[PDB]
């Protein structure tokens, strides 16, 4: 929103809002251009976005069309889950129920990764994503 776009310059619209407002994927915080240029030039620390402690990393930012914080994170989580599993047991033989059961397991693991669960099945899915990455190398 216009009332919150930067922890230092939240309402720069009266002072001509000519810069963008980057959002870090490990922070999900509205950080403007001018303040963040001082940030990653002097080391990778955390942002003080309402007293945040998540360490911001240098570069690897993104422009957003504002899908809140959930659907902005769920779109990259579904895109990261669609590349590791790829089209395994889906259209390899014109399968339908076996393709739907394999896509329901990919959707429920993505729903478990989106909700966070309790970092147990997600850590098991992190091993399964490591299993989906090791099976794509052999």
């Amino acid at each position: 929103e216009n009332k919150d776009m930067c922890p230092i310059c939240k309402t720069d619209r009266y002072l001509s809002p000519d810069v963008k407002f980057l959002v870090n994927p490990e922070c999900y915080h509205r950080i403007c251009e001018s303040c963040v240029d001082r940030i990653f030039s002097l080391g990778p620390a955390q942002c003080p976005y309402k007293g945040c402690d998540k360490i911001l990393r240098k570069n690897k930012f993104k422009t957003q069309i504002f899908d809140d914080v959930e659907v902005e994170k769920e779109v990259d989580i579904r895109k990261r889950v669609f590349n590791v599993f790829n089209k395994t047991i889906d259209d390899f033989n014109g399968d339908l129920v076996e393709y739907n059961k394999y896509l329901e397991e990919v959707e429920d693991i993505i729903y478990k990764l989106d909700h966070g669960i309790d970092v147990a099945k997600t850590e098991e899915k992190l091993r399964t994503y490591e299993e989906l990455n090791k099976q794509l190398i052999m």
Binding site: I65, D67, E74, F82, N100, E104, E107, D108
Partner: protein, 698 residues
């Protein structure tokens, strides 16, 4: 009459041979001509063979077809003395054919079906686990109620008085009588309806004779069946609708989760076929004509549940807010828009099956579903069905930056109009296609390609009683081309044009109806007319139809126009030729004996809907910049021609301005060109010769 037997012999030869016939009828003389021939062709064959299916265009033609059928039964019970198997059903609207919202709700809107499904599921809740039913339920489906219609004619007004005296329900009688298959009278918005015609076609069970009544706006219903505007306020409804599903999934996963889990297994096994078969007497969902879509073997978000389906929908609506957040004028291909969607989110190619199952799921799951929230889901689901299939002929348009506040208006263009008229040829044979406001009728072999025969109106006699002149020179021949422009160029000429109307109405102050091609010309002179002598010494009171014409305002202006001519006063009916209420009732001196038309009817140009349909029909029939300015302008003028010809017993004078009317045709083409001041002395003779030649030709 012998002229009525000419079209009746053609109707007796085409109903037993042809499958579709374009029969032209004269105005005000072809109503009971095909009415008696339809019951005679059945009596010549078998009376339980092909029943009569009537397709009007307005509710008035539905009401006018019921009183003529009473005259057909009175002519069959007095000239024969035998009471056969009666028929006739008044399939009208839902707010008019009701009893419960006229007592407690006191609302005559489109929410009468919401109290209908609340009483249908309320009677279902009272007969399963437990409000209850209503005033008169669980009795209208009896066999004695099924025999109240082949024995006595109770349709619409006769049935609404029957459901109050016998204490019955008008909804469950008519719905149980489509399966009986009588003489069904309905309008054009039900045969091409993507929520009603899927239920009508499963109860008539085909094998009947479709009577197309006033089939001249058939191309307009196919455009009106689709094209919904998304004027950004539905995004606020979809945002609040998405948060309601988050609370509903939180309410379903808090206690009674077995009702959603067993429904998830029922969707993973029985899918949508068993879901539609099990669901009875409940609120049906929405689809893009299931008899025309044709799709089976679906999947529920790839074997997922409602918690994963609402995540795709929340993924869907933000992309819709992303695409609407654009610059100004931008066109969109429905196939390329689906490709840009898959670059954002892989929603496959079948969201048509991902929504109709979830719409039926949330009705069974959420019992206290909100009205504005669930309707916001149906607006997205109807758009999701149209982007999945039916891409041929489809087009997505965006309204430009129009202040920009009112700029985010998204619209989809309909496909071919021949696709909606396609399944009525294989379902029914001998489809009688009749219209009294067509001149010529060669565009119907052209546009909408179907093999049919062409028959014109073979009835033209007594030209001394049908005065058909036209005005050319308006004293200087300057206001005729002045009204031709869309913008009101030179309002001083329009004040001179409005000065001629006071002179024209003061000549014959005996019923005046003035049509208009636009409401801008009505609002231009009403600001400072400076001429009320006809509104104080001739017509006195004023009956002007506004652009926002209310149904009560149109009803009050119609009754007072009948009260003006029945008191020796006369009134001026300032209506819009492109506006609502096309009328059709006359055959008396209470109607306007002289009908005035301001120039020729025009169409709203420089619009994206017109420019899309221009290039669409340019590839189809190559009728660019011809039929769009002439065939459309004729039918809007032919609605004014259908009111003057009120039979051979009543006279009437219809004048036409400008000079572009000579390039087109008209019903009974006997037209003489004269000036405006010249026709004032001609109409004074025509209002005295017709009063002397009425007793001479008898």
């Amino acid at each position: 009459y012998p002229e009525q037997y000419n079209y009746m012999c053609d109707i007796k030869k085409t109903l037993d041979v042809g499958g579709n016939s374009i029969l032209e009828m004269p105005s005000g003389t072809g109503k009971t001509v095909s009415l008696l021939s339809l019951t005679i062709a059945y009596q010549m064959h078998y009376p339980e063979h092909r029943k009569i299916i009537y397709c009007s265009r307005t509710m008035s033609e539905i009401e006018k077809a019921l009183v003529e059928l009473e005259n057909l039964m009175d002519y069959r019970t007095k000239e024969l003395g035998y009471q056969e198997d009666f028929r006739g059903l008044g399939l009208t609207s839902r707010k008019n054919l009701c009893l419960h919202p006229e007592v407690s709700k006191e609302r005559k809107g489109t929410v009468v079906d919401e109290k209908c499904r609340r009483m249908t599921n309320g009677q279902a809740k009272r007969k399963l686990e437990e409000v209850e039913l209503c005033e008169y339920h669980e009795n209208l489906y009896n066999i004695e109620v099924e025999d109240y219609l082949p024995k006595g004619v109770f349709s619409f007004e006769k049935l609404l008085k029957y459901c109050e005296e016998k204490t019955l329900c008008p909804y469950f009688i008519v719905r149980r009588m489509i399966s009986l298959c009588n003489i069904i009278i309905y309008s054009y918005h039900y045969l091409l309806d993507p929520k009603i015609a899927e239920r009508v076609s499963n109860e008539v069970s085909k094998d009947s004779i479709v009577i197309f009544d006033e089939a001249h706006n058939i191309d307009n219903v196919c455009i009106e069946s689709l094209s919904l505007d998304l004027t950004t306020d539905a995004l606020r409804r979809a945002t609040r609708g998405a948060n309601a599903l988050d609370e509903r999934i939180s309410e379903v996963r808090k206690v009674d989760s077995q009702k959603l889990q067993d429904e998830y297994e029922k969707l993973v096994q029985g899918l949508x076929x068993x879901x539609x078969x099990x669901x009875x007497x409940x609120x049906x969902x929405x689809x893009x004509x299931x008899x025309x879509x044709x799709x089976x073997x679906x999947x529920x978000x790839x074997x997922x549940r409602a918690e994963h389906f609402v995540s795709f929908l929340k993924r869907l609506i933000e992309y819709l807010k992303t695409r609407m957040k654009v610059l100004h004028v931008i066109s969109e291909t429905p196939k390329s828009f689906l490709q840009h969607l898959k670059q954002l989110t892989f929603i496959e190619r079948k969201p048509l099956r991902f929504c109709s199952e979830r719409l039926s799921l949330l009705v069974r799951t959420l019992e206290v579903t909100e009205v504005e929230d669930f309707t916001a889901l149906k607006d997205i689901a109807t758009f999701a069905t149209l982007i999945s299939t039916y891409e041929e002929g489809f087009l997505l348009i965006i309204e430009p930056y129009e202040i920009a506040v009112p700029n985010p208006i998204m619209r989809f263009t309909c496909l071919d109009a021949s696709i909606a008229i396609k399944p009525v040829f294989e379902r029914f044979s001998s489809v009688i296609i009749t219209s009294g406001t067509i001149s010529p009728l060669d565009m119907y072999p052209r546009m909408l390609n179907f093999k049919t025969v062409l028959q014109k109106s073979y009835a033209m006699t007594l030209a001394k009683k049908s005065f058909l002149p036209m005005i050319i020179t308006k004293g200087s021949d300057q206001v005729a081309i002045s009204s031709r422009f869309e913008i009101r160029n030179d309002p001083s000429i329009v004040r001179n044009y409005g000065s001629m109307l006071v002179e024209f109405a003061k000549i014959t102050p005996d019923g005046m109806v003035v049509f208009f091609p636009s409401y801008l010309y009505m609002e231009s002179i009403v600001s400072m007319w400076q001429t009320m002598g006809i509104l104080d010494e001739v017509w006195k009171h004023k009956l002007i139809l506004v652009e926002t014409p209310d149904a009560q305002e149109t009803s009050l202006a119609l009754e007072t126009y009948r009260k003006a001519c029945s008191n020796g006063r006369g009134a001026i009916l300032l209506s819009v030729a492109r506006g609502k209420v096309s009328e059709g009732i006359d055959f008396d001196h209470q109607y306007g004996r002289t009908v005035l038309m301001i120039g020729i009817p025009f169409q709203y140009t420089e619009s994206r809907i017109l420019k899309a349909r221009l290039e669409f029909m340019r590839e189809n029939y190559r009728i660019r910049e011809n039929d769009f300015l002439s065939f459309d302008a004729m039918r809007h003028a032919a609605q004014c021609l259908g009111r003057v010809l009120r039979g051979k017993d009543d006279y009437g004078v219809m004048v036409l301005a400008d000079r572009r009317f000579s390039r087109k045709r008209s019903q009974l083409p006997k037209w003489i060109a004269q000036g405006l001041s010249d026709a004032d002395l001609n109409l004074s003779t025509d209002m005295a010769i017709s009063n002397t030649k009425q007793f001479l030709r008898t």
